[PDB]
A paper describes a structure:
Compared to the RdRPs of other Flaviviridae representatives such as the NS5 of the Japanese encephalitis virus (JEV) and dengue virus (DENV) in the Flavivirus genus and the [name] of the hepatitis C virus (HCV) of the Hepacivirus genus, the pestivirus [name] contains a unique ∼90-residue N-terminal domain (NTD) that does not have notable sequence homology to any other viral or host proteins. The global conformation of our CSFV [name] structures is consistent with the recently reported CSFV structure with an RMSD value of 0.9 Å (95% coverage) between the reported structure and our representative C-682 structure. These structures together reveal that the NTD adopts a globular α/β fold with an α-β-α-β-β-α pattern. The NTD interacts with the palm of the RdRP core intra-molecularly with a mixture of hydrophobic and hydrogen bonding interactions. Collectively, these biochemical data indicated that the RNA synthesis fidelity of CSFV [name] is fine-tuned by its NTD through the intra-molecular interactions with the RdRP palm.
To better understand the nature of the NTD–RdRP intra-molecular interface interactions and whether they regulate the RdRP fidelity, we designed point mutations at the Y471 and E472 sites in the context of the WT [name] and the N- and C-terminal deletion mutants. The other two structures, obtained using the C-672 construct bearing the Y471A-[name] double mutation (C-672_AA) and the C-672 construct with the [name] single mutation (C-672_[name]), were solved in a space group different from those of the WT, C-682 and C-672 structures. Very interestingly, the C-672_AA and C-672_[name] adopt a drastically different global conformation with the NTD–RdRP interface no longer maintained (C-672_AA structure shown in Figure 3D). The NTD–RdRP intra-molecular interactions are fully disrupted, and the NTD is rather involved in a non-intensive three-way interaction involving two symmetry-related neighboring [name] molecules in the crystal lattice. As suggested by the two open conformation crystal structures (C-672_AA and C-672_[name]), the NTD–RdRP disengagement might occur in solution. The effect of [name] mutation was highly consistent with AA mutation (compare lanes 4/8/14/18 to 5/9/15/19), while the effect of Y471A mutation was slightly smaller than that of the [name] and AA mutations (compare lanes 3/7/13/17 to 4/8/14/18 and 5/9/15/19). As a small and unique globular domain, the NTD is connected to the RdRP through a flexible five-residue linker that could allow global [name] conformational switching leading to disengagement of NTD and RdRP, as suggested by the two crystallographic conformational states identified in this study. Although NTD–RdRP disengagement, a situation mimicked by the crystallographic open conformation state in a crystal lattice or the N-91 construct in solution, results in fidelity reduction, engaged NTD–RdRP with perturbation from point mutations can achieve similar level of fidelity reduction.
Numbering used by the authors: 13 to 87, 91 to 123, 131 to 531, 538 to 670
């Protein structure tokens, strides 16, 4: 017989659940005969069978090949940790990627017009038909090509020994007063500013709020294992821009943040977003600001006021822009390893394992598409990661300081003595003397390729150089200057009049909201009289209704006093808007034909026709309206919130 040799292998065949779905044969009736396996796993002494007339040796012959087959799949590809995603596959994958993995698939918001604000515009002659559309979506056929055109690529060639020279740079701007101090935050500070409707991962069913409401302990798990050193089932989810699941966990300082978003948004599970944030809150939100020149916490109206205070100190100043062609897909793995080392400098000793583990996942990122198509990302930064704004910024300044010093020979220590730098994620610029700025302008497009951050096509391979202050571009705005009553000057954030009217009149699937929008726009665009007069005309409607709260800002009490609180001047005090700069930004209106010759005066007459009746009328907040209407506006106490 052969059973004494069959008991040998049985005490080696892997365990399994005793399944009665078929025939579970004996540890000895195998050597009987005609009982050959079709599966291996033992139920404390059984396997499958087939009644296939096998010889007492043909049984052992087959079974030992399954044990060889099991000791093989168990004990490559798809990462050294991400191997779990193979289970969730069911179909073969059509994505046609040439530079990264693609193992199959898994089982798988219209924008509307503002009633009040839009009606106001049409009444003056503004043709909304001739205005840019600012919320278009995209087809999935177009979406699939977007991944092949932008995302699937081998990590760019970062020059030998570069990430040492980048640490050489960070060593200068390090903050020893904060070294090894950061810690996890309590659930209250994290929850304070959080969007209760944050998007959920592909395998998730509840959103950021419900995760907080019910399974707050499940997030505490992800935090523990990561802090202990265990691999977690890290996945990211990929959706196109303006998809119903493109939702920000934090507050955007303007409608421009969602605008400098890439076509392809990658975000981890909502439970994972909170796990990272309840820990790294001090870095990701950048609660103390550490990356020099990071303006993500700065509000829009002072962004250029703060800068002109530095531009006015250089004997002959110039500015240079960072146009990194699609920055998010330009991040090598040594980069994530660098930001990892940075995060360890300011975080406590207990939390390094959290940083060590999480970074390992962020290098080999498995990303599930909207239709189920799963791909493996060759590094790069997911645009929806918690570390995006924080990490990208630190990466921008370290690269751009390197590129500046490398093109000009200025030591890394002596950088602040010859230049100032401002960034926001990947967008930013850099101010210095005319002499130095030209070197970094020409040699820059080269040195930046060497680092792996390729500039755009540009002109003659020279970076964008701003010679006069008001030619700077930052956060999709440009500096425009206003002159107040008391003859002072101050720069406000400027933009194209069409691009503002487009973003102001549209929604995304409510008079209170219409007013909070008009106030939020007045803080930034009171320099544009066509827009100031619109905002006053909407705010002066239905003064009973308190304003909304879902937009960037809103007001508590009297808006003309809230404006005073944040701008440092009353809207009445706006005496003159810069002559030349207001031409350039109004010009897009005439080329598109969005206004008429009579539009400028017609908007003004409606304000004068409103605030001429005896009393205290909002529209009188305009300097000229009040000027020809005789009255003034006396506002009570008002404040600004978000």
């Amino acid at each position: 017989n052969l059973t004494p040799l069959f008991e040998e292998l049985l005490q080696q065949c892997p365990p399994g659940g005793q399944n009665k779905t078929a025939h579970m044969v004996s540890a000895y009736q195998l050597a009987q005969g005609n009982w050959m396996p079709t599966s291996c796993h033992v139920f404390m002494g059984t396997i499958s069978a087939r009644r296939t007339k096998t010889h007492p040796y043909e049984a052992y012959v087959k079974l030992r090949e399954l044990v060889e087959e099991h000791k093989m799949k168990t004990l490559s590809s798809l990462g050294k940790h991400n191997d779990w995603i193979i289970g969730k596959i069911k179909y073969q994958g059509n994505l046609r990627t040439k530079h990264m993995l693609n193992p199959g698939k898994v089982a798988e918001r219209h924008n509307v017009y503002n009633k009040t604000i839009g009606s106001v515009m049409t009444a003056t002659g503004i043709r909304l038909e001739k205005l840019p559309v600012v919320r278009a979506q995209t087809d999935t056929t177009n979406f699939h090509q977007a991944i092949r055109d932008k995302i699937d690529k081998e990590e760019n060639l970062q020059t030998p020994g570069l990430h040492k020279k980048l640490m050489e740079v960070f060593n200068a701007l390090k903050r020893p007063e904060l070294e090894s101090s950061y810690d996890a935050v309590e659930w209250e500070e994290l929850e304070r500013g959080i969007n209760r409707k944050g998007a959920a991962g592909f395998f998730e069913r509840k959103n950021i709020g419900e995760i907080l409401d019910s399974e707050k302990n499940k997030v505490e798990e992800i935090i523990d294992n990561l802090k202990k050193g265990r691999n977690i089932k890290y996945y990211e989810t990929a959706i196109p821009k303006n998809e119903k699941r493109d939702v920000n966990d934090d507050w955007t300082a303007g409608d421009f943040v969602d605008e400098k978003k890439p076509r392809v948004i990658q975000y981890p599970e909502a439970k994972t977003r909170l796990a990272i944030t309840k820990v790294m809150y001090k870095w990701v939100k950048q609660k103390p600001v550490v990356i020099p020149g990071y303006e993500g916490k700065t509000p829009l109206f002072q962004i250029f006021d703060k800068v002109k205070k530095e531009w006015d100190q250089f004997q002959n100043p110039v500015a240079v822009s960072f146009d990194t062609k699609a920055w998010d897909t330009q991040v090598t793995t040594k980069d994530l390893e660098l930001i990892k080392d940075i995060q360890k400098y300011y975080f406590k000793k207990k939390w390094h394992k959290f940083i060590d583990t999480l970074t390992m996942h962020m290098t080999e990122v498995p990303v599930i598409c909207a239709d189920g198509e799963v791909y493996i990302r060759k590094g790069q930064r997911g645009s929806g990661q918690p570390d995006t704004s924080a990490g990208n910024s630190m990466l921008n300044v370290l690269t751009m300081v390197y590129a500046f010093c490398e093109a000009t020979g200025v030591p890394y220590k002596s950088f602040d003595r010859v230049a100032k730098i401002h960034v926001c994620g990947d967008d930013g610029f850099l101010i210095t003397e005319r002499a130095l700025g030209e070197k970094f302008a020409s040699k820059g497009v080269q040195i930046l390729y060497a680092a792996g951050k390729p500039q755009k096509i540009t002109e003659g391979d020279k970076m964008k150089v701003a010679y006069q202050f008001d030619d700077i571009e930052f956060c999709s705005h440009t500096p425009i200057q206003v002159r107040w009553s008391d003859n002072t000057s101050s720069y406000m954030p400027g933009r194209n009049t069409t691009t503002i009217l487009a973003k102001m009149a549209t929604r995304l699937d409510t008079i209170a909201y219409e007013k909070a929008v008009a106030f939020s726009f007045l803080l930034m665009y009171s320099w544009n009289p066509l827009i100031r007069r619109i905002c006053l005309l909407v705010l002066s409607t239905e003064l009973q209704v308190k304003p909304g709260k879902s937009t960037t800002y809103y007001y508590e009490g009297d808006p003309i006093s809230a404006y005073k609180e944040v701008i440092g001047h009353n809207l009445f005090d706006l005496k003159r808007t810069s002559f030349e700069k207001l031409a350039k930004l109004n010009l897009s209106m005439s080329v598109l034909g969005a206004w008429t010759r009579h539009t400028s005066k017609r908007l003004l007459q409606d304000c004068v026709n409103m605030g001429v009746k005896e009393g205290n009328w909002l529209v009188n907040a305009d300097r000229l309206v009040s000027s020809k209407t005789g009255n003034r506006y006396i506002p009570g106490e008002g404040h600004t919130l978000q």
